[PDB]
Structures are given as C-alpha cells and as structure tokens.
Design a protein around this ligand. Structure first.
Ligand SMILES: O=c1cc(-c2ccc(O)cc2)oc2cc(O)cc(O)c12
Ligand SMILES: [Cl-]
Length: 275
C-alpha cells in the first residue's frame, strides 16, 4: 500500500528529537494547518531487496496496518503516513512525559505505584490481545508517560515494529526482541502467540517492584540462556517487604510452557490486580 508522497515539510515543522534506534528516529513536530503536535517517526527504507540495512516494505506495512486498527487510551495512535525514497514517516500521537524506563531510573516503586502503571499496561494489552495483536516488544522503553510530573502518570504503549496479527493462534517467524524481556519460546525460535507478551509483562512487573532485572546476565547469550532455563529468583534484599501475592502474580507469568502461563484475562482477575 502506498502512502502520501508530498514533502512532509510542506505540512509539518519538526522540533526536539525524542529518540532514535537502529532504523528509526522520532522527532516532535507540529502540523501547520492545526497547530497540533505529534511525534514524527522516520523509518529508514530498504534500498535493495537483499539488503540487511533499513526496514523491509513488508515490515513497515505490517506496523502501519496494525497502528491503523488501534484506538485505545493506553496505546499510541496513528495520525498520518508519508513516504519518500528514503523513509516512511509515521505521524504519531505525541506522548511527552518520556519513557517508563527513564522514570524508573530517576527514582523501585511501591506496590500501589507499580499496580497503577501495571493496570494501564494490562488494559492496553487486553485491548491488543482482544484484537489478536501480539506486541512482541513490551519493555519499559516502549511504555511512554503522558505527564511524568503527576503522582499517578498515565501511559501509552508504543513501538509496534515487531507487532503481529495472530489469526492462527501462533506465528512462526524468527520474531525476536530484547533478550531481557523475550519469552523462552522466542529464545528457542518456537511458534509465538499472545502468550509471549504475558511473559514480558512478568519481567516488567519484577523490575517495577525491585529495580532489578530477573534474567539479566553479563552477556546477551547468558541472558538468553537464563530466560530459556527460567533462571530467576526473588532476592530477599529486593523483595523482603513485597507481598506474597505480588510474587504469585509474577510467578504465574514467568512460566516456560506458554499454555500454562497466565493469559491477559487471567492477569486482570488475579487477586493482586482484581479490584
Ligand atoms: O525513542 C523513541 C521514541 C518514540 C516515541 C514514539 C511516539 C511518541 O509519542 C513519543 C516517542 O518511539 C520510538 C520508536 C522506535 O522504533 C525507536 C525509538 O527510539 C523511539
Ligand atoms: Cl512508535
């Protein structure tokens, strides 16, 4: 599918850079016609079929297709798409309070503070999973705060670059995210479903409560081996005053067999979360 090929600079002015990764850079921008503000994500295109640099058209179109489907307070929304010879430019909702990763760095949370974030994450993922969309890259860097200077910051899930529709219960694709957060089925290159996201939520929850990462080794291969072996424990130094119910919630997510792992619906009914 083709996107708007007018120069994006004809319609938007860019400002502060919000961040960049391997194949994308995100700039704050303002639409000339409305004065409304957005985040412009410039995704570098592949320039030959067999190249390893840039993002394939198929991968860009998948991200755009998924983004076009979603409208929920806890997920980013897509406003427009432009493209030129070098980039596809997604004009996305602006979330200006920064990464959950940075919020966590600057101050571990109480169980109340953790559940305040977690409930929003769970609500966003419930929406996604209800539409059979697996995110496949859930982690604190991909959770953005609307306003970080309130006591209970609101969040939105971002970065749908690995997201897939799961119409057949699983995808068998060599999809692979950040070692610290990927489920064992990802590490083992097995068929993947919505369950992989629930593992990631377990990892996020562990980090929220402790400030420590459950499977992190000194190298990527160590982290991956730890994940596959479910090599983690609740260190007393970190978890001594954490409730047994909170640990129960995590324990039922960090389960190797995806069929035995809590689903998103299970997580919302779990006694630690259920109102
Ligand atoms: O640093 C990043 C920031 C954002 C982002 C996306 C939307 C916003 O409203 C605010 C920030 O998306 C990203 C997407 C990527 O694939 C990589 C990034 O670094 C970012
Ligand atoms: Cl994004």
């Amino acid at each position: 599918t083709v996107f708007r090929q007018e120069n994006v600079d004809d319609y938007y002015d860019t400002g502060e850079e919000l961040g960049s990764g391997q194949f994308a850079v995100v700039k704050k921008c303002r639409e000339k016609s409305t004065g409304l503000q957005y985040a412009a994500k410039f995704i570098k295109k592949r320039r030959t079929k067999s190249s390893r640099r840039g993002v394939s058209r198929e991968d860009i179109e998948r991200e755009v297709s998924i983004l076009k489907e979603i409208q929920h307070p806890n997920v980013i929304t897509l406003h427009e798409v432009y493209e030129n010879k070098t980039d596809v430019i997604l004009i996305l909702e602006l979330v200006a309070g920064g990464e959950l990763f940075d919020f966590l760095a600057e101050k571990s949370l109480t169980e109340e503070e953790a559940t305040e974030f977690l409930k929003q994450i769970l609500n966003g993922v419930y929406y996604l999973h209800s539409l059979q969309i697996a995110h496949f890259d859930l982690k604190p860097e991909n959770i953005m705060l609307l306003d970080r200077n309130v006591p209970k910051p609101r969040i939105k899930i971002i970065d749908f670059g690995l997201a897939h529709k799961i119409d057949f219960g699983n995808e068998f694709k060599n999809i692979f995210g950040t070692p610290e957060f990927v489920a064992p089925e990802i590490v083992n290159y097995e068929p993947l479903g919505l369950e992989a996201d629930m593992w990631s939520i377990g990892v996020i929850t562990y980090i929220l409560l402790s400030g420590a990462s459950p499977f992190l080794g000194d190298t990527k291969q160590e982290t991956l081996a730890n994940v596959s072996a479910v090599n983690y424990e609740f260190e007393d130094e970190y978890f001594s005053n954490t409730s047994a119910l909170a640990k129960d919630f995590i324990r039922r997510l960090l389960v190797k067999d995806p069929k035995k792992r809590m689903t998103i619906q299970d997580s919302l009914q779990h006694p630690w979360i259920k109102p």
